[PDB]
Amino acid sequence: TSQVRQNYHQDSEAAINRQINLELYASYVYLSMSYYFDRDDVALKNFAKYFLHQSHEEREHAEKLMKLQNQRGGRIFLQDIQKPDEDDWESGLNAMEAALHLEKNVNQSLLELHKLATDKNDPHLADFIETHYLNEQVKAIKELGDHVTNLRCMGAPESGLAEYLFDKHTLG
Amino acid sequence: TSQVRQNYHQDSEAAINRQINLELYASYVYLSMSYYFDRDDVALKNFAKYFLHQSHEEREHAEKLMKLQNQRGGRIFLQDIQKPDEDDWESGLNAMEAALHLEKNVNQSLLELHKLATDKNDPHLADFIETHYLNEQVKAIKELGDHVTNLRCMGAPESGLAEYLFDKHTLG
Amino acid sequence: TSQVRQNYHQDSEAAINRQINLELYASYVYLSMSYYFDRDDVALKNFAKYFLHQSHEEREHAEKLMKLQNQRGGRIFLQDIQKPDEDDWESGLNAMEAALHLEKNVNQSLLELHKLATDKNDPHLADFIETHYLNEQVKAIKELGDHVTNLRCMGAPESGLAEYLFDKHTLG
Amino acid sequence: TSQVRQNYHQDSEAAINRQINLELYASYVYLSMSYYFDRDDVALKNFAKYFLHQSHEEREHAEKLMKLQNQRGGRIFLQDIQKPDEDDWESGLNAMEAALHLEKNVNQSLLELHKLATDKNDPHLADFIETHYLNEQVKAIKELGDHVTNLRCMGAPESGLAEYLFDKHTLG
Ligand SMILES: [Ca+2]
Ligand SMILES: [Ca+2]
Ligand SMILES: [Ca+2]
Ligand SMILES: [Ca+2]
Ligand SMILES: [Ca+2]
Ligand SMILES: [Ca+2]
Ligand SMILES: [Ca+2]
Ligand SMILES: [Ca+2]
Ligand SMILES: [Ca+2]
Ligand SMILES: [Ca+2]
Ligand SMILES: [Ca+2]
Ligand SMILES: [Ca+2]
Ligand SMILES: [Ca+2]
Ligand SMILES: [Ca+2]
Ligand SMILES: [Ca+2]
Ligand SMILES: [Ca+2]
Ligand SMILES: [Ca+2]
Ligand SMILES: [Ca+2]
Ligand SMILES: [Ca+2]
Ligand SMILES: [Ca+2]
Ligand SMILES: [Ca+2]
Ligand SMILES: [Ca+2]
Ligand SMILES: [Ca+2]
Ligand SMILES: [Ca+2]
Ligand SMILES: [Ca+2]
Ligand SMILES: [Ca+2]
Ligand SMILES: [Ca+2]
Ligand SMILES: [Ca+2]
Ligand SMILES: [Ca+2]
Ligand SMILES: [Ca+2]
Ligand SMILES: [Ca+2]
Ligand SMILES: [Ca+2]
Ligand SMILES: [Ca+2]
Ligand SMILES: [Ca+2]
Ligand SMILES: [Ca+2]
Ligand SMILES: [Fe+3]
Ligand SMILES: [Fe+3]
Ligand SMILES: [Fe+3]
Ligand SMILES: [Fe+3]
Ligand SMILES: [Fe+3]
Ligand SMILES: [Fe+3]
Ligand SMILES: [Fe+3]
Ligand SMILES: [Fe+3]
Ligand code: NA
Ligand code: NA
Ligand code: NA
Ligand code: NA
């Protein structure tokens, strides 16, 4: 057993390894979305920048979970990072909708992790999740919902003028 | 023979003279496009500025080829600069499409020049073209494609509001 | 066909997609190595920092290839990022040796890509690889070789004092 | 009853008084360790500084618990601060091992306090412990584990050169 390990259940250690993979996956999804908007036949540079920023932030979140695993004396076991479920993200609105869905899935996983930590009486882990993950997730979901609403209200995706102006005025 | 000339084939010298003319031609096409957008019945000032900038950049590219010809001990032979194929460029979208076509033609010529340099085992000339021309061309073609995509998606040329807003938000 | 595509062979497009995956893989290997050195039973913070920096640099290299694919009018097709071949990297020396092996594999792939570009008379792609990848690779391989030499000469891995002092004085 | 007291169980008040004593004890242990390293026949000045800093930090932690007791309307009851279990700490490695053991004992006490707060439905107390104590403890335990690992790997305590160089390069 690691000399630092204390009050850290095997199930929690495994769940942290799963969460590391999920954050790396989210990073990859956002990377894919970013470069879709960089295509010459899409060409929405601020959508591209927005999703690239999200990509980098998710990588930072994964690295913080890796640090946590080592802090608690668990052992990191990495898994393949699955490629995303689309190659072509169709439109600004469709990508924002897919990001909203992704973030709600990540939140669900984090809520299950918090429940596990609480069930195993691991308040350090529970607080780590609350402090560094849960409000970030709520903020991200709210922002994506706001973006979806505006794009729909503006007439996307059928109005290409809508996506163009949203790219300039909200994401720029 | 020039005291500096070394490993510089007559065919390469001739091809550089042709490329000088083609860059000067491109400069003239962009000059024409610029002042079309300055007409009182067109009046898109940022289209005008964008194409004037491209005009000046093409002139700089021609001057760099003239410098190259002298650096290698070739002799510059200038030719007439043909007037462009249109007087009236019709719309912002149509001008961007014509610029895309022009840039792909210039790129084709540069690729043939590179092939000639390679065939004549002239690595200085090949590298000059790669370093100062080929990625600039790829970037210019990508940018023009991006512009064409956005104008089409926004509803140009039939939507005059589209060209107006593109002039303000992308070219401004 | 993409409106920007010119002189860009289908085989080159596919090879760029493979190279994107390989750079993302390398990023993941370095991420794994970094956090191995962050374990409480390893605890070499400058090894950890060195490999994290390499991880981030490889991600940047992958993103530049994605940009290239779009610049040329190819289409990005992402693939799974395979997990690394080890979970436990054993020692500072062993990790440096594995990084050297990885970098030589990436270089081999880049050299094959350059050969393909040359065979398809794609000087833009050949120059992109030369300018942004080939000397970076030679520098990285030389640095890793230097590190391996010093660790071996100092008595690693059996001398834990050697790895400690290398962490402080070379990587710090 | 104190005019401020609300939702503050007698058992929680008593547990806070015990925790105040334990933090003061930890401060005293670190004070002892610090001045052991200041002996002329030990003479490791950065070990001495490291443990003196920990001593002062533990005192600050005790004072914050005293403030908490008063904030909640409990009453501070101080107890003797027991002298440490050693006078002679033997070596840098042995002191680091004893500090690791101490910090895990303090963490265990804090985890029991959190469980008590949760069992008495005192979320203010639970959050106070999580926010100001639990991650600090995890960080301290991880750091001490890292130090123990490095000293052992370097050949301490039998290698006096190891302790000397660790004092200079890690603690300096
Ligand atoms: Ca445990
Ligand atoms: Ca367990
Ligand atoms: Ca596990
Ligand atoms: Ca997994
Ligand atoms: Ca798969
Ligand atoms: Ca699929
Ligand atoms: Ca599918
Ligand atoms: Ca499908
Ligand atoms: Ca909390
Ligand atoms: Ca000659
Ligand atoms: Ca000749
Ligand atoms: Ca000639
Ligand atoms: Ca001519
Ligand atoms: Ca004529
Ligand atoms: Ca004519
Ligand atoms: Ca005509
Ligand atoms: Ca005509
Ligand atoms: Ca082609
Ligand atoms: Ca082809
Ligand atoms: Ca392909
Ligand atoms: Ca692949
Ligand atoms: Ca696999
Ligand atoms: Ca394997
Ligand atoms: Ca294996
Ligand atoms: Ca094996
Ligand atoms: Ca070159
Ligand atoms: Ca030294
Ligand atoms: Ca009360
Ligand atoms: Ca009570
Ligand atoms: Ca009491
Ligand atoms: Ca007591
Ligand atoms: Ca006593
Ligand atoms: Ca005693
Ligand atoms: Ca005793
Ligand atoms: Ca004794
Ligand atoms: Fe996340
Ligand atoms: Fe997220
Ligand atoms: Fe040009
Ligand atoms: Fe040009
Ligand atoms: Fe690389
Ligand atoms: Fe590399
Ligand atoms: Fe404490
Ligand atoms: Fe402490
Ligand atoms: Na943005
Ligand atoms: Na402009
Ligand atoms: Na370093
Ligand atoms: Na110190």
PDB file of C-alpha atoms in Angstrom, chain D:
ATOM      1  CA  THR D   1     -26.153  29.264  26.349  1.00  0.00           C
ATOM      2  CA  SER D   2     -24.099  31.618  24.201  1.00  0.00           C
ATOM      3  CA  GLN D   3     -26.207  34.145  22.275  1.00  0.00           C
ATOM      4  CA  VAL D   4     -24.471  33.090  19.031  1.00  0.00           C
ATOM      5  CA  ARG D   5     -24.728  29.322  19.421  1.00  0.00           C
ATOM      6  CA  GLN D   6     -26.837  27.604  16.778  1.00  0.00           C
ATOM      7  CA  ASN D   7     -26.759  24.019  15.519  1.00  0.00           C
ATOM      8  CA  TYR D   8     -23.515  23.350  17.428  1.00  0.00           C
ATOM      9  CA  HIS D   9     -23.553  20.065  19.294  1.00  0.00           C
ATOM     10  CA  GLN D  10     -21.796  19.610  22.631  1.00  0.00           C
ATOM     11  CA  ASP D  11     -19.879  16.680  21.107  1.00  0.00           C
ATOM     12  CA  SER D  12     -18.618  18.899  18.293  1.00  0.00           C
ATOM     13  CA  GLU D  13     -17.491  21.546  20.778  1.00  0.00           C
ATOM     14  CA  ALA D  14     -15.543  18.901  22.706  1.00  0.00           C
ATOM     15  CA  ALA D  15     -14.007  17.482  19.528  1.00  0.00           C
ATOM     16  CA  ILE D  16     -12.828  20.955  18.514  1.00  0.00           C
ATOM     17  CA  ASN D  17     -11.131  21.353  21.903  1.00  0.00           C
ATOM     18  CA  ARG D  18      -9.365  18.028  21.319  1.00  0.00           C
ATOM     19  CA  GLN D  19      -8.303  19.122  17.830  1.00  0.00           C
ATOM     20  CA  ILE D  20      -6.881  22.397  19.172  1.00  0.00           C
ATOM     21  CA  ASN D  21      -4.687  20.345  21.500  1.00  0.00           C
ATOM     22  CA  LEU D  22      -3.602  18.006  18.712  1.00  0.00           C
ATOM     23  CA  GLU D  23      -2.540  20.897  16.452  1.00  0.00           C
ATOM     24  CA  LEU D  24      -0.614  22.484  19.315  1.00  0.00           C
ATOM     25  CA  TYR D  25       1.033  19.099  19.920  1.00  0.00           C
ATOM     26  CA  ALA D  26       1.999  18.836  16.261  1.00  0.00           C
ATOM     27  CA  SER D  27       3.484  22.322  16.466  1.00  0.00           C
ATOM     28  CA  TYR D  28       5.583  21.199  19.418  1.00  0.00           C
ATOM     29  CA  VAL D  29       6.785  18.022  17.677  1.00  0.00           C
ATOM     30  CA  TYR D  30       7.954  20.083  14.699  1.00  0.00           C
ATOM     31  CA  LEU D  31       9.668  22.584  17.030  1.00  0.00           C
ATOM     32  CA  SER D  32      11.577  19.706  18.619  1.00  0.00           C
ATOM     33  CA  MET D  33      12.561  18.322  15.237  1.00  0.00           C
ATOM     34  CA  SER D  34      13.703  21.721  14.030  1.00  0.00           C
ATOM     35  CA  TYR D  35      16.154  22.293  16.859  1.00  0.00           C
ATOM     36  CA  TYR D  36      17.476  18.740  16.634  1.00  0.00           C
ATOM     37  CA  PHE D  37      18.727  19.665  13.161  1.00  0.00           C
ATOM     38  CA  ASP D  38      20.332  22.811  14.679  1.00  0.00           C
ATOM     39  CA  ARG D  39      22.562  20.720  16.959  1.00  0.00           C
ATOM     40  CA  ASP D  40      26.269  21.052  16.223  1.00  0.00           C
ATOM     41  CA  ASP D  41      26.501  17.263  15.731  1.00  0.00           C
ATOM     42  CA  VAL D  42      23.617  17.256  13.211  1.00  0.00           C
ATOM     43  CA  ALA D  43      23.930  20.641  11.523  1.00  0.00           C
ATOM     44  CA  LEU D  44      21.354  20.410   8.702  1.00  0.00           C
ATOM     45  CA  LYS D  45      20.117  23.993   8.551  1.00  0.00           C
ATOM     46  CA  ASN D  46      17.435  23.514   5.912  1.00  0.00           C
ATOM     47  CA  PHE D  47      15.906  20.550   7.729  1.00  0.00           C
ATOM     48  CA  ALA D  48      15.852  22.879  10.729  1.00  0.00           C
ATOM     49  CA  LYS D  49      14.163  25.650   8.730  1.00  0.00           C
ATOM     50  CA  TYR D  50      11.658  23.258   7.124  1.00  0.00           C
ATOM     51  CA  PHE D  51      10.457  21.899  10.455  1.00  0.00           C
ATOM     52  CA  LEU D  52      10.373  25.347  12.077  1.00  0.00           C
ATOM     53  CA  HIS D  53       8.095  26.526   9.281  1.00  0.00           C
ATOM     54  CA  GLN D  54       5.832  23.523   9.836  1.00  0.00           C
ATOM     55  CA  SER D  55       5.817  24.314  13.558  1.00  0.00           C
ATOM     56  CA  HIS D  56       4.605  27.852  12.946  1.00  0.00           C
ATOM     57  CA  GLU D  57       1.987  26.692  10.452  1.00  0.00           C
ATOM     58  CA  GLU D  58       0.543  24.186  12.958  1.00  0.00           C
ATOM     59  CA  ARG D  59       0.271  26.964  15.549  1.00  0.00           C
ATOM     60  CA  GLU D  60      -1.671  29.010  13.001  1.00  0.00           C
ATOM     61  CA  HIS D  61      -3.979  26.038  12.449  1.00  0.00           C
ATOM     62  CA  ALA D  62      -4.583  25.728  16.193  1.00  0.00           C
ATOM     63  CA  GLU D  63      -5.398  29.447  16.434  1.00  0.00           C
ATOM     64  CA  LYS D  64      -7.909  29.120  13.597  1.00  0.00           C
ATOM     65  CA  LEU D  65      -9.676  26.324  15.494  1.00  0.00           C
ATOM     66  CA  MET D  66      -9.773  28.524  18.601  1.00  0.00           C
ATOM     67  CA  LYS D  67     -11.346  31.255  16.479  1.00  0.00           C
ATOM     68  CA  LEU D  68     -13.870  28.715  15.155  1.00  0.00           C
ATOM     69  CA  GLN D  69     -14.825  27.594  18.670  1.00  0.00           C
ATOM     70  CA  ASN D  70     -15.615  31.193  19.595  1.00  0.00           C
ATOM     71  CA  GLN D  71     -17.351  31.888  16.287  1.00  0.00           C
ATOM     72  CA  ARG D  72     -19.784  29.052  17.011  1.00  0.00           C
ATOM     73  CA  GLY D  73     -20.290  29.979  20.681  1.00  0.00           C
ATOM     74  CA  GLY D  74     -18.390  27.059  22.100  1.00  0.00           C
ATOM     75  CA  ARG D  75     -15.921  27.522  24.913  1.00  0.00           C
ATOM     76  CA  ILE D  76     -12.208  26.849  24.616  1.00  0.00           C
ATOM     77  CA  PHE D  77     -10.763  24.498  27.220  1.00  0.00           C
ATOM     78  CA  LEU D  78      -7.030  24.110  26.777  1.00  0.00           C
ATOM     79  CA  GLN D  79      -5.073  21.085  27.939  1.00  0.00           C
ATOM     80  CA  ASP D  80      -1.405  20.416  28.539  1.00  0.00           C
ATOM     81  CA  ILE D  81       0.710  20.202  25.408  1.00  0.00           C
ATOM     82  CA  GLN D  82       2.495  16.884  25.770  1.00  0.00           C
ATOM     83  CA  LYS D  83       6.188  16.778  25.041  1.00  0.00           C
ATOM     84  CA  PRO D  84       7.091  14.768  21.923  1.00  0.00           C
ATOM     85  CA  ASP D  85       7.880  11.056  21.945  1.00  0.00           C
ATOM     86  CA  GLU D  86      11.552  11.574  21.130  1.00  0.00           C
ATOM     87  CA  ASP D  87      14.295  13.960  22.168  1.00  0.00           C
ATOM     88  CA  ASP D  88      16.754  12.728  19.513  1.00  0.00           C
ATOM     89  CA  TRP D  89      15.258  12.329  16.036  1.00  0.00           C
ATOM     90  CA  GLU D  90      18.216  10.256  14.722  1.00  0.00           C
ATOM     91  CA  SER D  91      18.407  11.438  11.100  1.00  0.00           C
ATOM     92  CA  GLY D  92      16.713  13.485   8.414  1.00  0.00           C
ATOM     93  CA  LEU D  93      14.964  10.396   7.075  1.00  0.00           C
ATOM     94  CA  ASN D  94      13.790   9.257  10.499  1.00  0.00           C
ATOM     95  CA  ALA D  95      12.373  12.708  11.275  1.00  0.00           C
ATOM     96  CA  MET D  96      10.549  12.825   7.940  1.00  0.00           C
ATOM     97  CA  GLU D  97       9.092   9.371   8.633  1.00  0.00           C
ATOM     98  CA  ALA D  98       7.945  10.498  12.084  1.00  0.00           C
ATOM     99  CA  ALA D  99       6.389  13.635  10.568  1.00  0.00           C
ATOM    100  CA  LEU D 100       4.544  11.520   8.012  1.00  0.00           C
ATOM    101  CA  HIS D 101       3.185   9.342  10.818  1.00  0.00           C
ATOM    102  CA  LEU D 102       2.152  12.419  12.814  1.00  0.00           C
ATOM    103  CA  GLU D 103       0.369  14.009   9.857  1.00  0.00           C
ATOM    104  CA  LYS D 104      -1.561  10.812   9.145  1.00  0.00           C
ATOM    105  CA  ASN D 105      -2.625  10.734  12.802  1.00  0.00           C
ATOM    106  CA  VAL D 106      -3.790  14.362  12.637  1.00  0.00           C
ATOM    107  CA  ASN D 107      -5.652  13.590   9.397  1.00  0.00           C
ATOM    108  CA  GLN D 108      -7.380  10.626  11.025  1.00  0.00           C
ATOM    109  CA  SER D 109      -8.579  12.914  13.812  1.00  0.00           C
ATOM    110  CA  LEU D 110      -9.807  15.501  11.310  1.00  0.00           C
ATOM    111  CA  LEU D 111     -11.696  12.812   9.365  1.00  0.00           C
ATOM    112  CA  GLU D 112     -13.374  11.686  12.576  1.00  0.00           C
ATOM    113  CA  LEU D 113     -14.293  15.307  13.298  1.00  0.00           C
ATOM    114  CA  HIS D 114     -15.818  15.642   9.832  1.00  0.00           C
ATOM    115  CA  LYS D 115     -17.811  12.443  10.358  1.00  0.00           C
ATOM    116  CA  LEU D 116     -19.086  13.787  13.678  1.00  0.00           C
ATOM    117  CA  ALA D 117     -20.086  17.086  12.099  1.00  0.00           C
ATOM    118  CA  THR D 118     -21.962  15.218   9.351  1.00  0.00           C
ATOM    119  CA  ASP D 119     -23.632  12.913  11.879  1.00  0.00           C
ATOM    120  CA  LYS D 120     -24.823  15.977  13.838  1.00  0.00           C
ATOM    121  CA  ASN D 121     -25.998  17.711  10.637  1.00  0.00           C
ATOM    122  CA  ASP D 122     -23.545  20.593  11.121  1.00  0.00           C
ATOM    123  CA  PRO D 123     -22.657  21.590   7.565  1.00  0.00           C
ATOM    124  CA  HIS D 124     -20.833  24.742   8.621  1.00  0.00           C
ATOM    125  CA  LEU D 125     -18.413  22.700  10.708  1.00  0.00           C
ATOM    126  CA  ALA D 126     -18.072  20.027   8.042  1.00  0.00           C
ATOM    127  CA  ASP D 127     -17.274  22.626   5.414  1.00  0.00           C
ATOM    128  CA  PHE D 128     -14.835  24.444   7.713  1.00  0.00           C
ATOM    129  CA  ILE D 129     -12.891  21.219   8.141  1.00  0.00           C
ATOM    130  CA  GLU D 130     -12.982  20.391   4.415  1.00  0.00           C
ATOM    131  CA  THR D 131     -12.015  23.883   3.321  1.00  0.00           C
ATOM    132  CA  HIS D 132      -9.261  24.728   5.812  1.00  0.00           C
ATOM    133  CA  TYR D 133      -7.886  21.337   6.973  1.00  0.00           C
ATOM    134  CA  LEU D 134      -8.519  18.335   4.723  1.00  0.00           C
ATOM    135  CA  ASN D 135      -6.691  19.314   1.521  1.00  0.00           C
ATOM    136  CA  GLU D 136      -3.885  20.930   3.534  1.00  0.00           C
ATOM    137  CA  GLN D 137      -3.446  17.574   5.247  1.00  0.00           C
ATOM    138  CA  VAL D 138      -3.461  15.607   1.989  1.00  0.00           C
ATOM    139  CA  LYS D 139      -0.847  18.003   0.552  1.00  0.00           C
ATOM    140  CA  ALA D 140       1.334  17.738   3.655  1.00  0.00           C
ATOM    141  CA  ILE D 141       1.193  13.931   3.667  1.00  0.00           C
ATOM    142  CA  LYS D 142       2.028  13.793  -0.045  1.00  0.00           C
ATOM    143  CA  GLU D 143       4.998  16.136   0.430  1.00  0.00           C
ATOM    144  CA  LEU D 144       6.345  14.140   3.372  1.00  0.00           C
ATOM    145  CA  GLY D 145       5.943  10.914   1.412  1.00  0.00           C
ATOM    146  CA  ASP D 146       7.840  12.468  -1.495  1.00  0.00           C
ATOM    147  CA  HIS D 147      10.635  13.505   0.900  1.00  0.00           C
ATOM    148  CA  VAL D 148      10.856  10.045   2.502  1.00  0.00           C
ATOM    149  CA  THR D 149      11.020   8.430  -0.945  1.00  0.00           C
ATOM    150  CA  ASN D 150      13.827  10.685  -2.113  1.00  0.00           C
ATOM    151  CA  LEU D 151      15.887  10.261   1.047  1.00  0.00           C
ATOM    152  CA  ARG D 152      15.531   6.468   0.886  1.00  0.00           C
ATOM    153  CA  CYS D 153      16.318   6.337  -2.829  1.00  0.00           C
ATOM    154  CA  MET D 154      19.391   8.539  -2.296  1.00  0.00           C
ATOM    155  CA  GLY D 155      20.755   6.130   0.348  1.00  0.00           C
ATOM    156  CA  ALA D 156      19.809   7.812   3.653  1.00  0.00           C
ATOM    157  CA  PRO D 157      20.330   7.526   6.511  1.00  0.00           C
ATOM    158  CA  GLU D 158      23.573   5.574   6.100  1.00  0.00           C
ATOM    159  CA  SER D 159      24.752   7.954   3.370  1.00  0.00           C
ATOM    160  CA  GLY D 160      25.389  11.208   5.197  1.00  0.00           C
ATOM    161  CA  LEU D 161      26.162  12.691   1.767  1.00  0.00           C
ATOM    162  CA  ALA D 162      22.513  11.937   0.818  1.00  0.00           C
ATOM    163  CA  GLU D 163      21.050  13.909   3.739  1.00  0.00           C
ATOM    164  CA  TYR D 164      23.483  16.765   3.112  1.00  0.00           C
ATOM    165  CA  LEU D 165      22.534  17.037  -0.564  1.00  0.00           C
ATOM    166  CA  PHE D 166      18.794  16.696   0.127  1.00  0.00           C
ATOM    167  CA  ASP D 167      19.089  19.506   2.669  1.00  0.00           C
ATOM    168  CA  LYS D 168      20.705  21.696   0.012  1.00  0.00           C
ATOM    169  CA  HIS D 169      18.687  20.854  -3.074  1.00  0.00           C
ATOM    170  CA  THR D 170      15.173  19.996  -1.865  1.00  0.00           C
ATOM    171  CA  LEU D 171      14.874  21.909   1.398  1.00  0.00           C
ATOM    172  CA  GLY D 172      17.106  24.816   0.426  1.00  0.00           C
TER     173      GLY D 172
END
